[PDB]
Amino acid sequence: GPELSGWISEQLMTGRIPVSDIFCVRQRVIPVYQVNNLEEICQLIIQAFEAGVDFQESADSFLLMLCLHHAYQGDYKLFLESGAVKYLEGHGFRFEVKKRDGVKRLEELLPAVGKNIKRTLAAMPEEEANAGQFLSFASLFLPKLVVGEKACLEKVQRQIQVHAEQGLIQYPTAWQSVGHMMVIFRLMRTNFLIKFLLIHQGMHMVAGHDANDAVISNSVAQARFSGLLIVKTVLDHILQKTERGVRLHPLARTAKVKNEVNSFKAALSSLAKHGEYAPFARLLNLSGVNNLEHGLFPQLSAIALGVATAHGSTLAGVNVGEQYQQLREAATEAEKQL
């Protein structure tokens, strides 16, 4: 019987159960701008992102201001002390507090270099939503972000109606347009920090009746093991459950597969070092996540599909070739003799 629940593969992946139990630097300075008109500045930030302004570098700073207004209510000392910053500080990030008074344009916050940013902001016209709504809407992208653009936006269109037919939150219809969704997709795809700050919040937040934080909570929970689902269902099928406990499938213990099983455990160990941040590894592009692709292990994919075929169930995203088809046929028969 295979580990169809998914508990063991989750515990192994997170790092709660060791890999050996079954199988046997430079910092980046980010400016934290201190202002009085935090609500006003954040409105000028949202408008710029709506317009499609690519701040590139200064993207982290202006996004960090939106998170301060909503999640930290304008408290700099509480933000610099929070667990989110504590993790970032030990993972190649440094937060420098810079005081700024009398700021009326985003050009006053921009660092000296990036000539197109001040030009695009100058051409912007002078004429609806809050910082929190922006953050919660961007969190709706996380579920299917790594999948593809069409798959991501479709999931975004579907979720919006779910949140509206339950009265949790209603977003401006100017956001529901293809163009603005694509602008936010491109931002979420390239900007690491926004993904992590939404993820850290979804992971560590006892919400609550705040509509935006509840949307972040659900979206972060939906994004768990995103882009690692195929390899998680494969690991679930290559795990044999006996009367004593859980053990590796006999077909993986053979001399022919031995080299691949060694590569798999080396990639599973790298993933498990991330602790609680392991389900979001592909989403966050963490160290050694690319070595954990389902395609890189076609012998383990053959044993996984074989065991599944015996039970009548299929594996979505698993395409076993002719070369490994022999191993698929042997795995089906071994599971049939129960």
Instruction: Please provide the DSSP assignment of 106-169 as one string.
Output: GGGTSPP---HHHHHHHSS------HHHHHHHHHTTTTTTTT-HHHHHHHHHHHHHHHHTTTS-
Give the Cα separation of 38 and 104 in Å (integer). 11
DSSP 92: T
H-state helical runs in the chain: 7-14, 38-51, 59-71, 76-81, 83-89, 116-122, 131-139, 149-164, 178-190, 192-203, 211-222, 229-237, 258-272, 298-310, 325-336
Residue partners of 1: CB distance under 8 A and separation at least 6: 240, 241, 338
Torsion of the alpha carbons at 121, 98, 213 and 144, rounded to the nearest 10: 60
Of 61, 52, 46, the C-alpha closest to 171 is 46
Contact between residue 48 and residue 124 where contact means Cβ atoms under 8 Å apart:
yes
Which tokens is 223 given? 């994004």
Give strand pairing partners of 31: 96
Using left for φ > 0, alpha for ψ between -120 and 50, and beta otherwise, residue 321 falls in: beta
Of 336, 253, 333, the C-alpha closest to 300 is 253
Q: What Å resolution does this PDB entry report?
A: 2.8
Name the 3-class secondary structure at 94: strand
Ordered by start, the domain boundaries in the chain are 7-24+225-336, 35-121+130-222
Contact between residue 95 and residue 27 where contact means Cβ atoms under 8 Å apart:
no
Residue partners of 167: CB distance under 8 A and separation at least 6: none
CB-facing half-sphere around the CA of 257: CA atoms within 13 A: 24
* Integer angstrom CA distances of residue 284 from 153, 196, 277, 292: 19, 7, 9, 14
* Mutual angle of helices 131-139 and 211-222, in 10-degree steps: 20
Give the Cα separation of 198 and 183 in Å (integer). 18
